[PDB]
Amino acid sequence: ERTYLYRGRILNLALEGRYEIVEHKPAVAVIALREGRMLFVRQMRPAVGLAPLEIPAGLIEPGEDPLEAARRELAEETGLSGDLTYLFSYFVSPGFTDEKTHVFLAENLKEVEAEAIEVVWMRPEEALERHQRGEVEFSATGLVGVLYYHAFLR
Amino acid sequence: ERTYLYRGRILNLALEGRYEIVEHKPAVAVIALREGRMLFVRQMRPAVGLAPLEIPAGLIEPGEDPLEAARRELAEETGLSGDLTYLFSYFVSPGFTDEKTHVFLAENLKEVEAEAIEVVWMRPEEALERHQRGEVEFSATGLVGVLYYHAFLR
Numbered sequence: 654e655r656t657y658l659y660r661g662r663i664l665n666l667a668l669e670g671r672y673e674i675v676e677h678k679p680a681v682a683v684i685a686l687r688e689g690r691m692l693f694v695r696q697m698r699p700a701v702g703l704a705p706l707e708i709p710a711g712l713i714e715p716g717e718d719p720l721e722a723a724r725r726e727l728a729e730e731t732g733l734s735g736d737l738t739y740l741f742s743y744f745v746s747p748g749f750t751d752e753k754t755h756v757f758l759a760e761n762l763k764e765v766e767a768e769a770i771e772v773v774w775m776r777p778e779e780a781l782e783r784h785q786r787g788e789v790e791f792s793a794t795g796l797v798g799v800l801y802y803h804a805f806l807r
Numbered sequence: 808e809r810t811y812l813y814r815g816r817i818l819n820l821a822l823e824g825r826y827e828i829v830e831h832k833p834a835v836a837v838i839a840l841r842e843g844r845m846l847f848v849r850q851m852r853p854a855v856g857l858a859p860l861e862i863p864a865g866l867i868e869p870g871e872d873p874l875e876a877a878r879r880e881l882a883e884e885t886g887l888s889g890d891l892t893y894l895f896s897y898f899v900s901p902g903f904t905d906e907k908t909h910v911f912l913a914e915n916l917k918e919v920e921a922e923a924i925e926v927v928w929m930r931p932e933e934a935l936e937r938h939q940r941g942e943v944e945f946s947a948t949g950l951v952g953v954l955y956y957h958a959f960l961r
């Protein structure tokens with residue numbers, strides 16, 4: 654039995670006994686490689702006061718399934734379309750939120766269109782090095798993309 | 808300028824203009840391999856209504872730095888100590904929360920002590936297969952541990 658303290662736009666805050674719980678829409682993220690570069694994005698994120706290295710990601714909207722949301726986000730954030738394959742999912746922080754992320758691979762990317770989101774094509778090796786030297790922060794989606802590449806796409 | 812709607816035990820809920828922001832303590836997570844098995848844990852997580860596959864993880868407490876928190880969580884959750892090396896960090900979901908996770912590798916594990924947390928030693932290959940067949944869910948920390956192993960520890 655949850656008690657609702659706040660019903661919002663992209664989250665609700667509930668109490669369930671002693672537990673503080675944030676309900677949040679599910680998300681998608683897209684891993685894409687082209688000529689050895691991974692498709693990252695950056696945007697100011699007010700929650701953290703900086704722009705971490707992410708991969709294209711967004712919330713699933715009403716009526717959409719994860720594959721469709723992934724296609725949409727890739728197009729809206731980067732202007733690209735590709736052949737998408739479902740990889741895996743994860744709960745971002747299941748000690749307090751139900752947000753679940755569905756991760757896809759995109760291949761055979763094509764431009765389907767030519768601004769608050771910066772497109773950052775970068776070799777994953779370089780993303781990991783910049784992070785190890787303190788020069789960029791990762792989101793979970795950016796780190797998952799870099800680790801997935803090193804595991805399976807070299 | 809944040810406006811606070813809720814100040815809690817492990818989170819605060821704020822508004823910053825149009826943005827809904829969850830402040831949350833930073834976390835640590837520990838990747839550990841022994842005889843080809845990774846050290847996972849599972850526990851009921853009320854936010855998601857199930858027990859996802861995680862790696863040992865916890866919140867940093869007052870006075871602690873990430874390395875110390877990692878040592879503590881490994882001992883409290885699994886009874887083990889090891890030689891810990893910092894790997895990388897990530898923001899769990901920077902579109903709404905500032906929660907940051909610092910991830911460590913543990914080697915040369917030793918038992919330093921002999922219950923709501925289940926210790927699940929499992930080959931990472933098997934964790935990934937069970938997930939692909941729908942049999943277990945991942946937290947971000949569990950997925951990061953599996954991908955890191957496949958990238959760097961085989």
Ligand SMILES: Nc1ncnc2c1ncn2[C@@H]1O[C@H](COP(=O)(O)OP(=O)(O)OC[C@H]2O[C@H](O)[C@H](O)[C@@H]2O)[C@@H](O)[C@H]1O
Nearest residue numbers: 671672673674745746747748749816817834864865866946
């Ligand atoms: N939602 C909650 N609200 C209230 N208190 C809680 C909650 N969850 C647990 N506690 C209490 O707080 C203590 C927290 O136990 P520790 O081991 O340091 O942290 P962790 O494993 O939960 O979280 C580690 C990360 O893993 C996951 O991704 C999380 O989302 C974090 O990102 C518990 O013993 C409870 O008393």
Ligand SMILES: Nc1ncnc2c1ncn2[C@@H]1O[C@H](COP(=O)(O)OP(=O)(O)OC[C@H]2O[C@H](O)[C@H](O)[C@@H]2O)[C@@H](O)[C@H]1O
Nearest residue numbers: 662663680710711712792825826827828899900901902903
């Ligand atoms: N904190 C917020 N509160 C209010 N509205 C917001 C917030 N953040 C953005 N919006 C609005 O909501 C729209 C969201 O844009 P989309 O691309 O679908 O999602 P994403 O990229 O933000 O989140 C995707 C994941 O990546 C990160 O890990 C996140 O935490 C998620 O887990 C924005 O255009 C804003 O209008």
Ligand SMILES: [Mn+2]
Nearest residue numbers: 709710711730
């Ligand atoms: Mn987005």
Ligand SMILES: [Mn+2]
Nearest residue numbers: 711726729730
């Ligand atoms: Mn978007």
Ligand SMILES: [Mn+2]
Nearest residue numbers: 768769770771
């Ligand atoms: Mn742009």
Ligand SMILES: [Mn+2]
Nearest residue numbers: 863864865884
């Ligand atoms: Mn824990």
Ligand SMILES: [Mn+2]
Nearest residue numbers: 865880883884
């Ligand atoms: Mn603990």
Ligand SMILES: [Mn+2]
Nearest residue numbers: 922923924925
């Ligand atoms: Mn136990």
